[PDB]
Structure 1
Amino acid sequence: MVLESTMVCVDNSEYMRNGDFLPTRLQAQQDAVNIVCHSKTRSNPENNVGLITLANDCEVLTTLTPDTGRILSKLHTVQPKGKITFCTGIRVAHLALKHRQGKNHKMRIIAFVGSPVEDNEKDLVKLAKRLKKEKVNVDIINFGEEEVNTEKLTAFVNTLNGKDGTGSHLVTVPPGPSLADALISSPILAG
């Protein structure tokens, strides 16, 4: 019985908009977000969800709210554009987790990857250990044009949760054009 506050971090870059899947990866994000937010709503009725975008400079669309329809409507009007600034996006997401009405709630951040990322090893390891210092768990969904062997992501697994605990998890890219939400239905509960 956990009270959980979730932050969704959605990509809309110019590589994510690529359409290797049967629909555009936009619709993959929409229906994946739909199923995960529905799962988190039946996880606990008084949970709340917030939304932020990844662009040249990140920006928040909705503060933590228990409602669902506003999130769907807000993300439905998004337009694919921009680059990826993963580090600053995670930083402002962590800022949004603070100043939260649910002081007794449990933090949770879910991230989307659909574009190449220019991450720095020392920067990412410092960020990972700092985020551990404040007891923060992060789940990351990589798909589409995946990073090379997700090797940067692997460093996170080495640094972030994954050792002496199962508080974090990573889902690999689903290469097939078929609906990826059904494939990722299992790890979200088995993470």
Structure 2
Amino acid sequence: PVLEATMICIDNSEWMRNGPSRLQAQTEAVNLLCGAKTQSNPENTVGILTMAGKGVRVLTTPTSDLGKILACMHGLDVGGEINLTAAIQIAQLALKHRQNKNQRQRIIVFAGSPIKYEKKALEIVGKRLKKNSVSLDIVNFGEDDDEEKPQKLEALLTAVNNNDGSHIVHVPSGALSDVLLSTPVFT
């Protein structure tokens, strides 16, 4: 099967309590997803960064050790607001400097917060990711009264999407991992 390095961008924003903690639903999905990825191909690597608190933090560069991946999300902090652009730049550079170049490059963003960016800003990021051969899965959750947010995220996807290799999933507040398990984020 496919050989792939994935960087997962966690939303640890103050928002993640509102709406099981939206933090806790994210952790469970990330856990199942790192399961799927490391199990499908032993040479796949997964890295984790957090987007909010007091700035973008890498908890682990891409690794095939599931224990390192799951351990580095025990006792997550929640607060501040996401820095999405800094998150994606740091995720793309980590993937660029992967060991095994035969790996496909994928970023996963959990967008659980309001998206405080213009369409044009996000298209530019999306086009740069595409020129860098990076695919993007976006998980949209926590509609904090922003009909603006879903539009902006679909505009990011359009700019990146290539060979239907990039995806978005809108999940209603009313089972995050059940939803994704049947979406191409998993399949």
Q: Is the 8 A contact 1:114 1:143 kept in 2?
A: yes
2:135 to 131, 134, 137: 137
Matched, 1:153 2:153: yes
Q: TM-score, normalised by structure 2?
A: 0.91
- Structure 2 partner of 1:15: 15
| Aligned-partner Cα distance in 1 for 2:16–2:185 | 25
Number of residue pairs matched?
A: 184
5+ long unaligned stretches in structure 1: none
User: Which amino acid counterpart does residue 10 of structure 2 have in structure 1?
Assistant: V
Q: Is the 8 A contact 1:7 1:108 kept in 2?
A: yes
Alpha-carbon deviation of 1:121?
Answer: 2.3
| Aligned-partner Cα distance in 2 for 1:190–1:31 | 13
- Structure 1 partner of 2:38: 41
Alignment of 1:53-132 (within 5 A): 53-55=50-52, 56-132=54-130
CA RMSD of aligned residues (A): 1.7
Q: Is the 8 A contact 2:5 2:45 kept in 1?
A: yes
| Aligned-partner Cα distance in 1 for 2:108–2:30 | 10
User: Which amino acid counterpart does residue 15 of structure 1 have in structure 2?
Assistant: W
Alpha-carbon deviation of 1:90?
Answer: 0.4
Q: Is the 8 A contact 1:15 1:145 kept in 2?
A: no
| Aligned-partner Cα distance in 2 for 1:157–1:115 | 17
Alpha-carbon deviation of 1:16?
Answer: 1.8
User: Which amino acid counterpart does residue 54 of structure 1 have in structure 2?
Assistant: M
Alpha-carbon deviation of 1:189?
Answer: 5.7
Q: Is the 8 A contact 1:17 1:26 kept in 2?
A: yes
1:5-31 Cα shifts (integer Å, max 9, x gaps)? 11111010011221x2xx111210111
1:22-68 Cα shifts (integer Å, max 9, x gaps)? x1112101111111111112221221111111014201011111101
More displaced, 142-151 or 26-35? 142-151
Change in Cα spacing, 1:27 to 1:168, as seen in structure 2 (3 Å) is same
Q: TM-score, normalised by structure 1?
A: 0.89
Q: Is the 8 A contact 2:119 2:156 kept in 1?
A: no
2:182 to 156, 181, 186: 186
Aligned identity (percent) is 49
Secondary structure of the residue aligned to 1:101 is coil
5+ long unaligned stretches in structure 2: none
Runs ≥4 residues deviating over 4 A: none
User: Which amino acid counterpart does residue 183 of structure 1 have in structure 2?
Assistant: V
